[PDB]
Amino acid sequence: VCNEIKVRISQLPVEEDIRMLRQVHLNMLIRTAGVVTIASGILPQLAVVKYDCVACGYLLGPFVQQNDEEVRPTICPSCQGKGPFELNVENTVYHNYQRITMQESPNKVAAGRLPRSKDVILLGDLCDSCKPGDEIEVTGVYTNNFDGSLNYKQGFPVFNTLIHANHITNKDKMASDQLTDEDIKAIRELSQDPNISQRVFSSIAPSIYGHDDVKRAIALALFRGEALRGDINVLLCGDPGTAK
Amino acid sequence: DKMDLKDQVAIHEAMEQQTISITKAGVKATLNARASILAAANPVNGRYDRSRPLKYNVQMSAPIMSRFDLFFVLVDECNEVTDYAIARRILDNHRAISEHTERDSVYKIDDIKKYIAFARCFKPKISDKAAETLVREYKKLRMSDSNNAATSSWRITVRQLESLVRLSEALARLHCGKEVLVEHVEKAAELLNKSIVRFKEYKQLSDVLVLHMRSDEDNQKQSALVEWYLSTNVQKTICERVIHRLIHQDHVLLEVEQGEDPTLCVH
Amino acid sequence: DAKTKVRELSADKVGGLVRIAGQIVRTHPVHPELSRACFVCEDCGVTTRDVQQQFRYTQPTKCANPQCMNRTRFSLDVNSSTFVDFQKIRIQETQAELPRGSIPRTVDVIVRGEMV
Amino acid sequence: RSYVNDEDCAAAIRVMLESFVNTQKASIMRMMKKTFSRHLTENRSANELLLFILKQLIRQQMHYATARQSVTIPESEFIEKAQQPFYTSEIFASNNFLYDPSKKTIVQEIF
Ligand SMILES: [Zn+2]
Numbered sequence: 001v002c003n004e005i006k007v008r009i010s011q012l013p014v015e016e017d018i019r020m021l022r023q024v025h026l027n028m029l030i031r032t033a034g035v036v037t038i039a040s041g042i043l044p045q046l047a048v049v050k051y052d053c054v055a056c057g058y059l060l061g062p063f064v065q066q067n068d069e070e071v072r073p074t075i076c077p078s079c080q081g082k083g084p085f086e087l088n089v090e091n092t093v094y095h096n097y098q099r100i101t102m103q104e105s106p107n108k109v110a111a112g113r114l115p116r117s118k119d120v121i122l123l124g125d126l127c128d129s130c131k132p133g134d135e136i137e138v139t140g141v142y143t144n145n146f147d148g149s150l151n152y153k154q155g156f157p158v159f160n161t162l163i164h165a166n167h168i169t170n171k172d173k174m175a176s177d178q179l180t181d182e183d184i185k186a187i188r189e190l191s192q193d194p195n196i197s198q199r200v201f202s203s204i205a206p207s208i209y210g211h212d213d214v215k216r217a218i219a220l221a222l223f224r225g226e227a228l229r230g231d232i233n234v235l236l237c238g239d240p241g242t243a244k
Numbered sequence: 245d246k247m248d249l250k251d252q253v254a255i256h257e258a259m260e261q262q263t264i265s266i267t268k269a270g271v272k273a274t275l276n277a278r279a280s281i282l283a284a285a286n287p288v289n290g291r292y293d294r295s296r297p298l299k300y301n302v303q304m305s306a307p308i309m310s311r312f313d314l315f316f317v318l319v320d321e322c323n324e325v326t327d328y329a330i331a332r333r334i335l336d337n338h339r340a341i342s343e344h345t346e347r348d349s350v351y352k353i354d355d356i357k358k359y360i361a362f363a364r365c366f367k368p369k370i371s372d373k374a375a376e377t378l379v380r381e382y383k384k385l386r387m388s389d390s391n392n393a394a395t396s397s398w399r400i401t402v403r404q405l406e407s408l409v410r411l412s413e414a415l416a417r418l419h420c421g422k423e424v425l426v427e428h429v430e431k432a433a434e435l436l437n438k439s440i441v442r443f444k445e446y447k448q449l450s451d452v453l454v455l456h457m458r459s460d461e462d463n464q465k466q467s468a469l470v471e472w473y474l475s476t477n478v479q480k481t482i483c484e485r486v487i488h489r490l491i492h493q494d495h496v497l498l499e500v501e502q503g504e505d506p507t508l509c510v511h
Numbered sequence: 512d513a514k515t516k517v518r519e520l521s522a523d524k525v526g527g528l529v530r531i532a533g534q535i536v537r538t539h540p541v542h543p544e545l546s547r548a549c550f551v552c553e554d555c556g557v558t559t560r561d562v563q564q565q566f567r568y569t570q571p572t573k574c575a576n577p578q579c580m581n582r583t584r585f586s587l588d589v590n591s592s593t594f595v596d597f598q599k600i601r602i603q604e605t606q607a608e609l610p611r612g613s614i615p616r617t618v619d620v621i622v623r624g625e626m627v
Numbered sequence: 628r629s630y631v632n633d634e635d636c637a638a639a640i641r642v643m644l645e646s647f648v649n650t651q652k653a654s655i656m657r658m659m660k661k662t663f664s665r666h667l668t669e670n671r672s673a674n675e676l677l678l679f680i681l682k683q684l685i686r687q688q689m690h691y692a693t694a695r696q697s698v699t700i701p702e703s704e705f706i707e708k709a710q711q712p713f714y715t716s717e718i719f720a721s722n723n724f725l726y727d728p729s730k731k732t733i734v735q736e737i738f
């Protein structure tokens with residue numbers, strides 16, 4: 001099935017805002033939360049690379065692919081020379097990769113401020129696990145790297161920063177639509193009673209008083225015709241303030 | 245009222261949700277816009293016309309007009325005493341500026357700044373008698389509007405109770421009270437009524453006639469209708485003229501069999 | 512107590528301690544900035560410490576080993592370097608400053624450390 | 628159910644008629660309520676009908692007293708319209724309806 005079991009870690013005790021990360025937290029483990037705004041497609045990325053030596057046919061490597069480098073050899077030891085190189089199609093290894101952008105939750109922003117945002121990188125079986133609009137919570141390592149174009153942009157030797165994800169909880173996952181034997185027994189016991197139609201009709205929206213026509217229309221529309229449209233469509237029109 | 249409709253739609257979309265949304269080029273975001281709006285406008289025909297309701301004298305759309313708790317209407321009173329008082333106040337402004345002299349207010353504006361900044365930390369709760377009073381005052385408002393349904397300048401719905409609770413909480417914050425009392429609800433209702441308030445014999449008599457005939461439909465000539473009105477010469481002549489107008493102008497009443505003493509029914 | 516107006520910031524006054532007042536228009540997000548760096552010589556493996564940065568990313572002019580001729584081939588070390596919190600801000604003239612028939616001026620401001 | 632019953636057909640027919648008749652103008656609505664009264668009016672109780680009669684009379688009295696905080700009506704009109712124990716019910720009292728036998732009168736307070 002596999003090669004390696006990953007360990008994900010949850011319930012790390014200290015939370016940070018995106019707004020409050022400093023140079024202290026570089027190469028530390030942190031936990032944040034926010035809303036997804038942008039997500040890329042799933043793409044394969046190099047993980048372990050081997051090369052051919054054109055001069056003598058020797059296979060160079062393996063080289064574990066680092067985060068921000070074009071790793072290459074320079075000398076083939078089996079001929080002790082700088083022979084030309086080609087990528088070995090047969091022994092190169094890939095893994096899935098995805099990049100998302102996360103923003104501070106609008107509920108937690110103070111008076112008159114703008115929310116901040118960060119980029120997050122997902123690898124392997126963490127990919128495809130969330131959508132734009134999801135409230136999520138991330139645990140990972142906060143790191144930095146140099147970028148000369150970012151230096152030229154800001155006019156000072158600033159550094160790019162990222163979070164490498166290690167665990168995600170999606171707070172907007174809906175409940176599983178699966179029923180136990182206890183639930184099915186309760187459904188059968190409810191369905192056996194003779195007053196069940198009036199029970200359902202009156203128990204839809206119990207705070208609203210009257211309007212049994214609207215209640216029965218909604219109740220029969222939640223169930224569906226068998227089908228040739230099977231759906232039952234309902235329109236309401238009413239004065240403002242009439243709780244429509 | 246001089247804004248473009250594009251900018252007015254943008255303000256209304258922000259006022260509905262108390263949020264601003266962005267989706268352009270390479271950024272998407274949502275923001276908070278928790279701000280109170282104070283607005284001023286001039287009436288459409290240059291002067292306010294008291295003979296029409298508020299919907300015609302202002303060029304706003306009804307969804308935008310629904311967003312405001314309080315409307316105030318200000319008119320030129322054309323009164324000698326008020327003109328004299330206004331002229332004295334203007335010349336007192338000029339006289340004080342001419343000698344760099346302050347007025348004798350009770351408090352300093354800085355003290356008022358401290359008071360208003362301090363009072364907004366309070367979060368008053370609703371008391372039991374205040375809840376009872378809120379129910380009673382909402383009933384009073386809707387009853388009086390129903391009594392003047394054809395002539396009131398502005399309708400009354402559920403939203404007025406939300407405005408009433410907001411005004412009561414603001415008054416409690418003004419007095420630094422930790423709970424809403426009966427007096428806050430009472431004065432909020434008084435202020436709301438004073439903001440809201442903005443042929444009739446013909447309506448009253450025609451209403452009595454139509455109400456009797458409509459009630460007689462729960463049981464089912466012109467002289468017999470007049471006799472029922474009189475039992476319930478100027479009044480008889482006025483009733484005949486009212487029936488004449490309700491037939492020949494309003495068409496509320498129809499002559500089922502025509503004649504000098506016709507049978508009548510409601511259209 | 513020595514306030515100066517925004518239009519009085521001549522090129523004479525570079526390097527002196529000054530007070531000013533303004534209204535803030537923009538507040539850019541936070542970045543770490545390099546302050547003092549350590550570089551490993553790729554030929555001989557010696558670490559050269561405390562290369563002070565200017566506005567630009569800089570490598571040492573000379574290897575610290577006196578028996579080494581390298582002046583180009585260096586690699587930065589991250590876990591020995593020191594990083595500084597940084598923020599950039601824009602300000603505008605307050606209305607009380609303005610001359611006759613004039614439009615307000617704007618300034619770029621640099622902030623570091625605990626004031627971010 | 629595994630099959631459509633006559634009760635299911637009756638429920639569907641009643642929903643269809645009740646929804647259709649309400650969309651018309653008021654005179655056509657009165658005529659069609661009279662026409663299809665067997666299918667429409669079956670489910671009401673006498674207490675609900677008496678509440679309807681009482682509240683309609685109170686509405687007519689509110690209109691009448693406005694045109695000419697509480698409402699009082701003679702009992703004889705309520706009896707005659709019912710003809711054309713309810714005072715003890717929870718429905719009657721919870722709508723703030725009350726009764727005075729010394730004058731034979733319905734009472735209500737609007738506050
Ligand atoms: Zn080789």
Ligand SMILES: [Zn+2]
Pocket residue numbers: 552553554555556557574575576579580581
């Ligand atoms: Zn060296």
